[PDB]
Amino acid sequence: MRYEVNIVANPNLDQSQLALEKEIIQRALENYGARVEKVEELGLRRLAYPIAKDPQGYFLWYQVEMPEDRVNDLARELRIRDNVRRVMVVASTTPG
């Protein structure tokens, strides 16, 4: 299945720390057997609506192909790190 993986990392990291976080994510995708189809580094962005107390984050977006039964474990592995604040995974298709 094709998925979009949206990651929000700590906005306060220096680029050396961010490089480590990005490397860890890519290694996790490969280690879980995902085929990585696109990586977009969106960078520092701000949630405007709804209203959050901590609206800034460092946004990363991945498009991947992988089996549905492996997605949950991957997502949880990605978010275990303290510098990964949020992970959201959307399947690009549904049964209907």
Add this chain to the structure above:
Amino acid sequence: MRYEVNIVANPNLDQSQLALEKEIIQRALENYGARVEKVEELGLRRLAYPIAKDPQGYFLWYQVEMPEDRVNDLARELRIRDNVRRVMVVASTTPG
């Protein structure tokens, strides 16, 4: 400011109803004075992570240019309709 507007509509609508919802959104963007730079109709998708009781939705994505002081009112106008389940607006830049 440039914003990404992520809309999740009711996944159970027929295309006649969805056409009305899309027309309403575009009219609201124009009526609020946003410049609409891209419209992507992503269609029926499923939240895979985190786990939601109602994970399916009809996803729409807009990129717009508009003043920051008008975004909140626009977002609230967009979501007042029952068929618009979620609106999320992200500013593409931050002060830092």
